[PDB]
Design a binder for this molecule. Structure first.
Ligand SMILES: [Mg+2]
Ligand SMILES: [Mg+2]
Ligand SMILES: [Mg+2]
Ligand SMILES: [Mg+2]
Ligand SMILES: [Mg+2]
Ligand SMILES: [Mg+2]
Ligand SMILES: [Mg+2]
Ligand SMILES: [Mg+2]
Ligand SMILES: [Mg+2]
Ligand SMILES: [Mg+2]
Ligand SMILES: [Mg+2]
Ligand SMILES: [Mg+2]
Ligand SMILES: [Mg+2]
Ligand SMILES: [Mg+2]
Ligand SMILES: [Mg+2]
Ligand SMILES: [Mg+2]
Ligand SMILES: [Mg+2]
Ligand SMILES: [Mg+2]
Ligand SMILES: [Mg+2]
Ligand SMILES: [Mg+2]
Ligand SMILES: [Mg+2]
Ligand SMILES: [Mg+2]
Ligand SMILES: [Mg+2]
Ligand SMILES: [Mg+2]
Ligand SMILES: [Mg+2]
Ligand SMILES: [Mg+2]
Ligand SMILES: [Mg+2]
Ligand SMILES: [Mg+2]
Ligand SMILES: [Mg+2]
Ligand SMILES: [Mg+2]
Ligand SMILES: [Mg+2]
Ligand SMILES: [Mg+2]
Ligand SMILES: [Mg+2]
Ligand SMILES: [Mg+2]
Ligand SMILES: [Mg+2]
Ligand SMILES: [Mg+2]
Ligand SMILES: [Mg+2]
Ligand SMILES: [Mg+2]
Ligand SMILES: [Mg+2]
Ligand SMILES: [Mg+2]
Ligand SMILES: [Mg+2]
Ligand SMILES: [Mg+2]
Ligand SMILES: [Mg+2]
Ligand SMILES: [Mg+2]
Ligand SMILES: [Mg+2]
Ligand SMILES: [Mg+2]
Ligand SMILES: [Mg+2]
Ligand SMILES: [Mg+2]
Ligand SMILES: [Mg+2]
Lengths: 44, 54, 90, 113
RNA sequence: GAAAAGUACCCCGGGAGGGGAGUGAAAGAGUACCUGAAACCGUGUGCCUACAAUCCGUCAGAGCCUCCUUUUCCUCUCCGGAGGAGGGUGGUGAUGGCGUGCCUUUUGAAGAAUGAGCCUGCGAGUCAGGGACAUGUCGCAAGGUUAACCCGUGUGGGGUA
RNA sequence: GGGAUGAGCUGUGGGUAGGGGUGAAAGGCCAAUCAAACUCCGUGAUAGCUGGUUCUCCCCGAAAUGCAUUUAGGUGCAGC
RNA sequence: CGCGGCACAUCCACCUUGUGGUGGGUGUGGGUAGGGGAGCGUCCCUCAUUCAGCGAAGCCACCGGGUGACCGGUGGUGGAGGGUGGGGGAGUGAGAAUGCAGGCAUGAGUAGCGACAAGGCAAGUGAGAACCUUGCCCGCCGAAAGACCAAGGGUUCCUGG
């Protein structure tokens, strides 16, 4: 682990962990998306 | 070792005035019927057309 | 506006106060009109008129003097006709 | 007193201290004597400083009708202009500031025997 | 800037930038633009400074420079102040004496204890309540005063619980 | 310099979550943070502690003692 | 002690004989924590009055004034709001918090300019060439410093500028 950094990008794992269809499965995630529409974020 | 105090206006100016360019001597050149001025170490090349006067 | 394209107008304030000219073009969303002969501009090439504010001209009533202008329902078409004050014509 | 001409050079991308090193050679000298001191000075600011003495000598001859053989650099100085700010990354996540300095250069040549 | 009338044309320059012209009431408003402070950075000029130990000031004090004025003289005399003598401002300060920064915190700090590179702007006893105690002051007075509420364009009039 | 056919190394996809995980066990590691992560809220947490608190003049002018104190660098009351 | 200015307490005289004023004695006037008294400057509102495109504010300089905070005059700059008096209300005064934001110094023309493959010349291009182009030479990698994918990146690719 010499030289290895924290962020290793992978676009399929950004979507399966943080994406829209995971947020919309639990009540905690619907309250996050409803609170980012309410603040006015362009990305949810 | 960092500086302990900022220098006063007198102490920074005395050092800074000794940063100055040494000018060079200029002698006279007539090539192609034109009076120019070159430094003396370039006098042979000025007489041979090797110096561009811009 | 109450000032139209074909109308002749009298300048009542400004540098060209007193000049009679006619409107060349009207700019309603700025309240400005172009009158021929007024505030000539020495523009550098590559003199014509500049627009003045509409509150500096008055419409001339075809009997000499300028006027504030009023309206009148013509009773036979149902559209208001722009009539003059101070002896009431057109 | 004497008939003169002014040329200014604004927003020259030369540091003002580096400009002042090369105008100390030519202060008070005549214009013919100053253009060839600045021709053979090895410093880079001697390029822009020479062109403003040259454009001051041109405005005296053209716009003033003055004799080119009688012109002298009467007044020269270098002010400063606006400074752009930059960032140089350093060790262990430090960031230092780099400054791009500019100069305003004024030349007043005057005609005198 | 009232209006873009945002600098035609000529010159120097590869450009950038400028100078002359021209516009405008004003470019001492030129798309880096209203007013344009201080720190900070130059150029010019007056005085001082290269045998002296300086919390950088203060009091004593010579000279030099500058600009105004008193007495005869250049008396061209209305002139001009022309030069000097006397006084007076303004600048500077050879030289002598005296002289241990500011804040905070301490028995006691110039302290080698703390905080402060500099300038500009901002940054700390306020407000509520028929509260409580004490007072200044005003109205009524053996009485004083209403609360919610009601009526009015309001700061006015009612309202005894 | 050690291991280098193994209790090996590695890729891809997956699983375990905060008094919880995971640990050939060092209180190691859990996004450069770990004797209880991060973020938002309670919230302007609280601090007998340290610091800061901004114009002027006039008149007067202390104390660092007693007693009590989970008290001794705090406070109440007396003294001034 | 002498001569002159100010302030406070007290006493003695009076003018509506303390709401006070004037005059004359004597006394007093270092001051931190802290207590009491009286004022200056900024801003907003109300009433009254007075300035201002024949130049308000703000700013800069010089000359003056007051016991202090501070004030006034005159001029320059500037372009639209101020001054005085009776009242009312304060986001009402900074030099310190390793305060916050912006601008700028000091260090200083100082350290550094990212591997130990290594560049040179001729010609060109252009205002400008150690670094760009072309040619030759020299050098370095060669289980990569060559050629391909994958993840990731996203127009960086090509042509003309
Ligand atoms: Mg009008
Ligand atoms: Mg890094
Ligand atoms: Mg031009
Ligand atoms: Mg011009
Ligand atoms: Mg004009
Ligand atoms: Mg103006
Ligand atoms: Mg500017
Ligand atoms: Mg400006
Ligand atoms: Mg000496
Ligand atoms: Mg000694
Ligand atoms: Mg001690
Ligand atoms: Mg003490
Ligand atoms: Mg200290
Ligand atoms: Mg010290
Ligand atoms: Mg320090
Ligand atoms: Mg071995
Ligand atoms: Mg090995
Ligand atoms: Mg082995
Ligand atoms: Mg655990
Ligand atoms: Mg242990
Ligand atoms: Mg970690
Ligand atoms: Mg815990
Ligand atoms: Mg709570
Ligand atoms: Mg607290
Ligand atoms: Mg006393
Ligand atoms: Mg105690
Ligand atoms: Mg007590
Ligand atoms: Mg005394
Ligand atoms: Mg006292
Ligand atoms: Mg006190
Ligand atoms: Mg004027
Ligand atoms: Mg104001
Ligand atoms: Mg003043
Ligand atoms: Mg004035
Ligand atoms: Mg003024
Ligand atoms: Mg005022
Ligand atoms: Mg008032
Ligand atoms: Mg008040
Ligand atoms: Mg305040
Ligand atoms: Mg300040
Ligand atoms: Mg500060
Ligand atoms: Mg800062
Ligand atoms: Mg050094
Ligand atoms: Mg070096
Ligand atoms: Mg390199
Ligand atoms: Mg070549
Ligand atoms: Mg080889
Ligand atoms: Mg390419
Ligand atoms: Mg391209």
């Amino acid at each position: 682990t010499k030289g290895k950094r924290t962020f290793q990008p992978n676009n399929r794992r950004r979507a399966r962990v943080h994406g829209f269809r995971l947020r919309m499965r639990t009540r905690a995630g619907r309250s996050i998306v409803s609170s980012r529409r309410r603040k006015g974020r362009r990305t949810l | 070792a960092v500086p302990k105090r900022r220098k006063s206006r007198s102490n920074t100016r005395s050092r800074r005035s000794q940063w100055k360019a040494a000018k060079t001597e200029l002698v006279g050149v007539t090539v192609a019927g034109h009076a120019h001025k070159v430094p003396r170490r370039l006098l042979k090349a000025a007489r041979l057309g090797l110096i561009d006067f811009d | 506006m109450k000032v139209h394209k074909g109308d002749t107008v009298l300048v009542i304030s400004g540098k060209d106060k007193g000049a009679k000219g006619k409107v060349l073009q009207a700019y309603p969303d700025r309240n400005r009109v172009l009158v021929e002969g007024v505030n000539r501009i020495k523009k550098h090439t590559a003199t014509q008129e500049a627009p003045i504010h509409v509150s500096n001209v008055m419409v001339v009533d075809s009997d000499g003097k300028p006027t504030r202008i009023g309206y009148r329902v013509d009773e036979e078409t149902g559209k208001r006709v722009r009539i003059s004050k101070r002896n009431g014509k057109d | 007193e004497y008939p003169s001409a002014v040329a200014k050079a604004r927003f020259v991308r030369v540091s003002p201290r580096k400009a002042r090193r090369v105008i100390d050679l030519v202060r008070g000298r005549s214009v013919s004597d100053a253009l060839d001191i600045l021709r053979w000075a090895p410093q880079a600011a001697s390029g822009p400083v020479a062109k403003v003495i040259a454009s001051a000598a041109a405005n005296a001859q053209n716009n003033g009708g003055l004799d080119p053989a009688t012109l002298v650099v009467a007044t020269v100085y270098a002010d400063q202009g606006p400074t752009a700010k930059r960032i140089r990354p350093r060790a262990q996540g430090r960031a230092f500031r780099i400054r791009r300095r500019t100069s305003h250069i004024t030349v007043v040549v005057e005609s005198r025997p």
